[PDB]
Amino acid sequence: SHMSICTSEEWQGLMQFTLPVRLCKEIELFHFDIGPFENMWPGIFVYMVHRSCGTSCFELEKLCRFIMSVKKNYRRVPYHNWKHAVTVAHCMYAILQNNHTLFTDLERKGLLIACLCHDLDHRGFSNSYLQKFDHPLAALYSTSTMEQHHFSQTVSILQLEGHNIFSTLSSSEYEQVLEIIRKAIIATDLALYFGNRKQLEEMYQTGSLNLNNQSHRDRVIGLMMTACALCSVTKLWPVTKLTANDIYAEFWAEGDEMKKLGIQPIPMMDRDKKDEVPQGQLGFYNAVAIPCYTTLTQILPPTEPLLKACRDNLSQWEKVIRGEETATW
Ligand SMILES: Nc1nc2c(ncn2[C@@H]2O[C@@H]3COP(=O)(O)O[C@H]3[C@H]2O)c(=O)[nH]1
Ligand SMILES: Nc1nc2c(ncn2[C@@H]2O[C@@H]3COP(=O)(O)O[C@H]3[C@H]2O)c(=O)[nH]1
Ligand SMILES: Nc1nc2c(ncn2[C@@H]2O[C@@H]3COP(=O)(O)O[C@H]3[C@H]2O)c(=O)[nH]1
Ligand SMILES: [Mg+2]
């Protein structure tokens, strides 16, 4: 295998980890911020899987090896890191806890794993960069470049000794869950969000949306994945602002690399144009975040708290633009 593998101490440590009792009820909520509980992150994921699919959904030892190896294969980049992975998985958990009867046991397992692995081995570089500089990854994966790589790395971890949490599924269900995971991870490519949201809006408005129609179902799951991947915009303001700093730290590092190679970066990736960030955020919320959560709320109403939170943060960015912001840290 070309993947890094967890050590015995790492996975055995997770197997023995116990979440504090009082914290459990907080994990059920949409706005929960895992930020202040780093040592507990892998344990929070185990808990979410168990509450969603039962204590025997996966053999515990294999699940712990899988989680700790996934952690080891996320890089030390500013944003697309291990913290992000667990944050996205938690949003999926909150959505599922409020819509669990609409999804099968197989889909719940697949989606939680897809979320934990959706940015596996991210290098801190965008698909735009990889394609622009003809990186080998872009030759191998023409579109949704990094996302196809993330799925390939996910399959690779399952192949590590004692890491295949899905081997006990029948051969048909095994193939089915890998497909759910592949489509879900690919769905996190924002380039695909615009078309997917437009199609879902048409399906919903014409009254043709049918959750039992597999093609419709795949699209709903795709929008759910987008919603989870974008969830930093659904946290309490200070948490959302702190995360934005990480997002931009990564964007700016990419812009720095571009300048070194003679290609000027777009303003968003230019460290010297940080004054444009508030307006950029307004643009992003208006073009992507708000419509995403608006459509998600239409199709799955219990997800409304995410939309409400996004609207609140849009209002905070507007305050920044008007020069009304309080103190930021
Ligand atoms: N590179 C690599 N190392 C492995 C593999 N399987 C086991 N190891 C390593 O072997 C080590 C044995 O002791 P450990 O502390 O459990 O940590 C283990 C890993 O670091 C593998 O497939 N690839
Ligand atoms: N490369 C590597 N494999 C290890 C290590 N410890 C255990 N292994 C396992 O031993 C196996 C020997 O055959 P393999 O196909 O190379 O796959 C290897 C791993 O599954 C280690 O430190 N490095
Ligand atoms: N592209 C983009 N992403 C943003 C912006 N503000 C926040 N984000 C989030 O940061 C993420 C960075 O990686 P991404 O996969 O491109 O998805 C991005 C969004 O979820 C913005 O202005 N542009
Ligand atoms: Mg990604």
- By C-alpha distance, which of 27, 112, 21 is closest to 66? 112
The range of the structural domain enclosing residue 284 comes to 1-329
Q: Pocket of ligand 3, candidates 119, 126, 190, 246: which has the most ligand atoms within 8 Å of its Cβ, to mutate?
A: 190
The dihedral formed by the CA atoms of 242, 243, 246 and 250, expressed in degrees to the nearest 10: -150
First to last CA, the chain: 42
5: CA distance to ligand 1 center in Å? Answer: 6
Distances (CA, A) of 162 to 6, 60, 156: 11, 11, 12
Ligand 1 within 6 A of CB of 8: yes
The dihedral formed by the CA atoms of 39, 41, 42 and 44, expressed in degrees to the nearest 10: 120
Task: Please state the domain count of the chain.
Answer: 1
Tokens in use for 205?
């408005």
Rounded (5°) CA angle 310-315-316:
95
Tokens in use for 322?
């008007």
CA distance 198 to 121: 30
Q: What is the CATH number of the domain that holds 254?
A: 1.10.1300.10
Tell me, rounded to whole angstroms, the distance of Cα 156 from its chain centroid: 19
Which approach determined this entry? X-ray
CA distance 328 to 292: 27
Ligand 1 within 6 A of CB of 2: no
Axis-axis angle for helices 190-206, 214-229 (nearest 10)? 130
User: Judging by beta carbons within 10 Å of its beta carbon (0-12, 13-18, 19+), is residue 222 exposed, middle or buried?
Assistant: buried
Ligand 1 within 6 A of CB of 1: yes
User: Judging by beta carbons within 10 Å of its beta carbon (0-12, 13-18, 19+), is residue 145 exposed, middle or buried?
Assistant: buried
CA distance 52 to 224: 16
Alpha-carbon torsion 145, 150, 153, 159, what sign? negative
CA distance 65 to 5: 8
Query: Within 13 Å, how many C-alpha atoms sit on residue 213's CB side?
Result: 10
- By C-alpha distance, which of 60, 170, 151, 61 is closest to 113? 151
Distances (CA, A) of 195 to 89, 105, 192, 292, 314: 24, 28, 6, 11, 23
Backbone angles phi, psi at 255, to 5 degrees: -65, -35
Backbone angles phi, psi at 268, to 5 degrees: -60, -30
Let me know: does 187 contact 144? Beta carbons within 8 Å.
Answer: no
Residue type, 55: T
Let me know: does 223 contact 149? Beta carbons within 8 Å.
Answer: no
